[PDB]
Amino acid sequence: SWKVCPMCSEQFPPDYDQQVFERHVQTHFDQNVLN
């Protein structure tokens, strides 16, 4: 269940919460660089 952010290419392990991951991805459309 690894997840990849399509905007910054960070990878998120299987146990990383899906909804928090999705929120991360969406935040790039507010601010491209999040670190």
Partner 1 sequence: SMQIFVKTLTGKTITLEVEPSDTIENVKAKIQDKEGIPPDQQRLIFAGKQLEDGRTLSDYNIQKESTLHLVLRLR
> Torsions phi, psi of 22, nearest 5?
-60, -40
| C-alpha to C-alpha distances, 11 to 5, 21, nearest whole angstrom | 6, 10
Residues 8, 21: contact at Cβ < 8 Å? no
Applying the rule CB under 5 A, the residues between 1 and 35 that interact with Zn ion are 5, 7-8, 10
24 marked among binding-site residues: yes
Applying the rule CB under 8 A, the residues between 1 and 30 that interact with partner 1 are 1, 3, 6-9, 18, 21-22, 25-26, 29
Annotated binding site: 5, 8, 24, 28
Binding residues for Zn ion, rule: CB under 5 A, are 5, 7-8, 10
